[PDB]
Amino acid sequence: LSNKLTLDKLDVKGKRVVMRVDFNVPMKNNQITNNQRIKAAVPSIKFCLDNGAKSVVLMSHLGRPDGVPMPDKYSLEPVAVELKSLLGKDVLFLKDCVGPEVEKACANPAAGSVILLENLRFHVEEEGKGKKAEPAKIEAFRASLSKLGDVYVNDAFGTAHRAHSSMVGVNLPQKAGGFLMKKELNYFAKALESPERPFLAILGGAKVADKIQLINNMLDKVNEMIIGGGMAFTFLKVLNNMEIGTSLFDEEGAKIVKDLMSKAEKNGVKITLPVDFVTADKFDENAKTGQATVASGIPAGWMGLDCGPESSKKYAEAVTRAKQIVWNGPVGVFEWEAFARGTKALMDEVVKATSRGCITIIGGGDTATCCAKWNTEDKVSHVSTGGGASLELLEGKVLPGVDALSNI
Numbered sequence: 001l002s003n004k005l006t007l008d009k010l011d012v013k014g015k016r017v018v019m020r021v022d023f024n025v026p027m028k029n030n031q032i033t034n035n036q037r038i039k040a041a042v043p044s045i046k047f048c049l050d051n052g053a054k055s056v057v058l059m060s061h062l063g064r065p066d067g068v069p070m071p072d073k074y075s076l077e078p079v080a081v082e083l084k085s086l087l088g089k090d091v092l093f094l095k096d097c098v099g100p101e102v103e104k105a106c107a108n109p110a111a112g113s114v115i116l117l118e119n120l121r122f123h124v125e126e127e128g129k130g131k132k133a134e135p136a137k138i139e140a141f142r143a144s145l146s147k148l149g150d151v152y153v154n155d156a157f158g159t160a161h162r163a164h165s166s167m168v169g170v171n172l173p174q175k176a177g178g179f180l181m182k183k184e185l186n187y188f189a190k191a192l193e194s195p196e197r198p199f200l201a202i203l204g205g206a207k208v209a210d211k212i213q214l215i216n217n218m219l220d221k222v223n224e225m226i227i228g229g230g231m232a233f234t235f236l237k238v239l240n241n242m243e244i245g246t247s248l249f250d251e252e253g254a255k256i257v258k259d260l261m262s263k264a265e266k267n268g269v270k271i272t273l274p275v276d277f278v279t280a281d282k283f284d285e286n287a288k289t290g291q292a293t294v295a296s297g298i299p300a301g302w303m304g305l306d307c308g309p310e311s312s313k314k315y316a317e318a319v320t321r322a323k324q325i326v327w328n329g330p331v332g333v334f335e336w337e338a339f340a341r342g343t344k345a346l347m348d349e350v351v352k353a354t355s356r357g358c359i360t361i362i363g364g365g366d367t368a369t370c371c372a373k374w375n376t377e378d379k380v381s382h383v384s385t386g387g388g389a390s391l392e393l394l395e396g397k398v399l400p401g402v403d404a405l406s407n408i
């Protein structure tokens, strides 16, 4: 951010501040399971209020409602409640994020007002697609958001890889990076400058279509890569002709698997894929469970939701060799006890590695929740609010949310 406006240089006195945050927090049984991402924005929010901001209007997405209002499933209302406790101030929640009624709520607020808008992705104009997109409405959506403040702050590190309307399209004269954006970028700048080697990337989780497309460039930066979680099945189906049942599979990514493996070979990147699994008869906490290996395949109508013990051993071996690790994506559905062992075991190993001097970086809305669940947040080097955003920094890219900020 050396050439970007940041919040420490933004005059907020008497100003309405419209602020993009990443409040895309994990939810289970409808409750917030980790408030990490909300707590992480509090320093910027408090700074604005302590320095005389007239208001702070907070906007985020939650999940992927795909441009349709889904207040039953993906409302940010619970976040407003949580933010109250964390701030020490009350926060007014609006049931939309644009236009007439929201614009009036934000036009001239009482001094010190904190306002949280509803899920930006209830409108197809945020992402620009759903559910297909339309330029004049996209422009109009961005215009509306811009009226909600006099100055703009982006503290949404976790979303900074998304060139979405709220992230790159707000038109106000001063667009400043917040303190979380600064903290995260500064950490990664230093950690990625001259990594300790071997440098291992651990890629798991879900969102396989997105994550598989990051591997090509990551292969130029790391010395080893664990490909686990939901992403492994695309690789195993292609490379081993493994039956994968109903496990996550990315048709598009499947087409580049062999090219990625070629490139890993060319670059001397050792790829560790799982070799065994805990299977489920459906995507449910209380599914019937089984075991499978790559040789056995996964039966029809069953899905692999965790790696098995033989995979955990191979993952542990990669971790023991590492002097630096970036981990994004649990290696199983760790939210459900039946499918949590692989991720706990990997967590144990990553903690052990830190203790003997490994630089260990865990990132993501869900992967950071692994740290919270097993009480390891202060037992690794850094826990980032960014998952994909962090992987994009590892690739060596500028994040669109940062690029869109005002130059100094």
Ligand SMILES: Nc1ncnc2c1ncn2[C@@H]1O[C@H](COP(=O)(O)OP(=O)(O)O)[C@@H](O)[C@H]1O
Pocket: 204, 205, 206, 207, 228, 229, 230, 231, 248, 304, 305, 306, 328, 329, 330, 331, 332, 333, 334, 335, 363, 364, 365, 366, 367, 368, 386, 387, 388
């Ligand atoms: N084999 C699997 N099949 C389906 N989902 C999985 C599997 N392994 C992990 N997951 C899920 O991936 C989800 C989070 O992945 P992701 O969003 O990519 O991570 P992060 O939010 O840290 O970037 C977790 O909710 C976990 O339940």
Ligand SMILES: [Mg+2]
Pocket: 364, 365, 366, 367, 387
């Ligand atoms: Mg996630």
